Amino acid sequence: AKRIDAALIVKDGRVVKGSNFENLRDSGDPVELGKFYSEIGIDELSFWDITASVEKRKTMLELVEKVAEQIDIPFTVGGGIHDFETASELILRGADKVEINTAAVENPSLITQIAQTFGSQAVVVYIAAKRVDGEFMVFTYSGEKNTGILLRDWVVEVEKRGAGEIVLGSIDRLGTKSGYDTEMIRFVRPLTTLPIIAHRGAGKMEHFLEAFLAGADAAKADSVFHFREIDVRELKEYLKKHGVNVRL
């Protein structure tokens, strides 16, 4: 089964810019939004925390505790997870998976440490990549640092260190609603046996179809769902109609 993920960008315990589901008590409540999503056909949730501390560590730990109590589908936490101890805390508190990016590049052993303790399934490595002069290049630090590492090298190393899946984010699709980067998905597919999660570019139902054709095991989106540009049920019906094996 191909998987549909909703990403919720979270700040001080709030969904950043809320949602359009007026049927909910509190549309900026991420635990109520995530729960609603799990009931309408979202397969997995991501929470990305952008709390500019010093309340971050605690806001995140409270979020997952609260999410873990209410929601019956898999979830990931990310947003500033920089070391083993931070990952350990979040998982021991009820996160199923942790998402790491920059920390993973500056310490590929961190992947292995999380995987050796909690299982590979608990390690999501977000790979943010961009076209640089003919090459797919890996960028760190909210896409600000050109690491010099080739996408093809990093993917192999990510699997080799024991990551359970890869969120493949196209910096070239940041803020666009014109499609997922299917060329980047097709580039990576033969290189890894891990699940590939497409992120950045979604604007319409057809885009999801394209990403799965390209070899994505999952497709993640955010505001497109939160602002009701795409209905999750309509999406899954559309995908199923066209030969995609989604849990309806």
Number of strands: 11
Q: Assign the CATH architecture.
A: Alpha-Beta Barrel
| Gyration radius over CA | 17 Å
Element-by-element helix/strand order: EEHEHEHEHHEEEHEHEHEHH
Distance between the termini: 10 Å
Q: What's the number of domains?
A: 1
CATH fold-level label: TIM Barrel
Summarize the main sheet: 8 strands, parallel, barrel
Portion of residues within helices = 25-40%
Which class do the helix and strand fractions yield?
alpha/beta
**What is the count of DSSP helices, taking H or I runs of 4+ residues?**
10
Strand order of the largest sheet: 1-3-4-5-6-9-10-11
Structure description:
The chain has a single domain (1-248), classed as Aldolase class I (TIM Barrel, Alpha-Beta Barrel). The chain has 10 helices and 11 strands. It has helices spanning 30-40, 56-70, 84-92, 102-105, 108-118, 151-161, 182-188, 205-213, 223-226, 232-241; strands at 3-11, 14-15, 44-49, 75-78, 97-100, 123-132, 135-140, 145-150, 165-170, 196-199, 218-221. It is globular and about 45 Å long. The PDB classes it as lyase. The entry lists the keywords beta barrel, lyase. The assembly is monomeric. The entry is titled "Evolutionary optimization of computationally designed enzymes: Kemp eliminases of the KE07 series".
